[PDB]
């Protein structure tokens, strides 16, 4: 009779990425009109993270669903709309992400 202990199933975080120069150290996948990264979800997902890049230093993990970037919601966004938002984000990139337990 081992009772299941309390466990987090889903998280929504606000992560602030800091890049003085160069990149955010992440790749994104998916978007409206593209093949899904996870099952049927058409949302923008983080497909990889550089270990020596800023995103890893901010807590960004692989599989995080990208919901918002510095005040722009990416719900139902085409892939190139997320792309443009991220490239055009300045030195501080605060994003809202949806995370799921593995």
């Amino acid at each position: 009779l081992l009772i299941e202990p309390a466990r987090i199933e889903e998280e929504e975080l606000t992560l602030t990425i800091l890049r003085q120069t160069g990149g955010l150290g992440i790749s994104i996948a998916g978007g409206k009109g593209s093949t899904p990264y996870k099952g049927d979800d058409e949302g923008i997902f983080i497909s990889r993270v550089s270990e020596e890049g800023p995103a890893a230093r901010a807590g960004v993990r692989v599989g995080d669903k990208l919901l918002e970037v510095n005040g722009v919601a990416l719900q139902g966004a085409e892939h190139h709309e997320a792309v443009e938002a991220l490239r055009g984000a300045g030195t501080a990139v605060q994003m809202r992400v949806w995370r799921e337990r593995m």
Binding site: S27, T35, H79
Partner: peptide, 7 residues
């Protein structure tokens, strides 16, 4: 159509 983009 599958896009992946590093930024």
């Amino acid at each position: 159509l599958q896009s992946e983009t590093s930024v």
